[PDB]
Ligand binder design. Structure first.
Ligand SMILES: [Mg+2]
Lengths: 201, 14, 201, 14
């Protein structure tokens, strides 16, 4: 048994049962090993969640690093988009990524993000703030829409509403246009505001 | 039902 | 039994056991009532989370509405700041608010937000997307803050953490400042982005 | 354990 196999069977278990069903205990059963054998690969559920999130980035986050010739605006836009793909790759994916700590194998990538953004004119503090804001926005966009998908099935259908007109036009527009367009519009607004700040400085 | 369909459309909560 | 007694016992239970611990079965036990007595006040866990989210907005979301005379920038900034305080008010607060939905009793507030933004020159569509973006960034901010607080106590200390220098400077800066400055800077990037877009139109 | 407290500092992950 190696760590790759443990991660792949845990990602298969995450899709079958969801994050709350993902226990070291059912993972062992699925691998054919005793529960204490897994300890050596993943010491507890947070270590397992960290490894699953990082495997989803290694598969899907194709813009983790800036690419040759990209502008900082194309790197931040593309980074948010491929981070969203990693969060959507598995059931409860964004819940698994929350609160993750990279390992040392990710440090070259993170140092290269900050070397690139400071080469492209940000201060180290504002490069931290821009990377922070893109990813937080992306996590909130995916988690809210994924939760809405489940929560809308758990509310009883009302006999009465009474909804005022601007609010009814707004929720109808949002639904018609879709949550992915909404995400791209907010992402663009962040990028435009980073550019305003970089100029003013 | 229009009312039923609207109640299912996302609405912000802040 | 009263709505206020059910909501305050449920928010105490949330702080004791977290969101996955919070079930209508355990709340009825906590209240000392049989499950059908509680069902009359709370039908299911989706109704209980929707009611806890609105209670936290009623206590802490001081800028749910625009103030008369306030600029649109100040409204959106103050709205995200107070919504952040509502999500921070309880254990797993952001997860409790994720995917919730106003009642009819809040529709007038949401209508007023839209009327306000459109009076100040936004299109309905861009007012919707400015509200959406600020709340999604704020939810993502607090979801990650809260889960980091949990996760950082679960993870064993690595023997040696050999970290490259820009990354170490950036995580030390964030730690020294705490989450609020990065939050405020991200929020200000969104507001600068909306202003570019509005001035343009 | 200054080293343990450093290991608890937040790091982004994207
Ligand atoms: Mg938890």
């Amino acid at each position: 048994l190696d760590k790759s196999k443990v991660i792949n069977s845990a990602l298969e278990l995450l899709n079958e049962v969801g994050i709350e069903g993902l226990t070291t205990r059912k993972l062992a059963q699925k691998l054919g090993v005793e529960q204490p054998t897994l300890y050596w690969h993943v010491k507890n559920k947070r270590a397992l969640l960290d490894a699953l999130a990082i495997e989803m980035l290694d598969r899907h986050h194709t813009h983790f690093s800036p690419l040759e010739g990209e502008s900082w605006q194309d790197f931040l836009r593309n980074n948010a988009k491929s981070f969203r793909n990693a969060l959507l790759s598995h059931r409860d994916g964004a819940k698994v990524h929350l609160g993750t700590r990279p390992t040392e194998k990710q440090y070259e990538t993170l140092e290269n993000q900050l070397a690139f953004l400071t080469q492209q004119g940000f201060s180290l503090e504002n490069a931290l703030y821009a990377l922070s804001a893109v990813g937080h926005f992306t996590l909130g966009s995916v988690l809210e829409d994924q939760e809405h998908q489940v929560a809308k099935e758990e509310r009883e259908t009302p006999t009465t509403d009474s909804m005022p007109p601007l609010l009814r036009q707004a929720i109808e527009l949002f639904d018609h246009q879709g949550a992915e367009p909404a995400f791209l519009h907010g992402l663009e607004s962040l990028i435009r505001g980073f550019e305003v700040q970089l100029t003013a400085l | 039902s229009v009312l039923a369909a609207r109640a299912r459309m996302w609405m912000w909560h802040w």
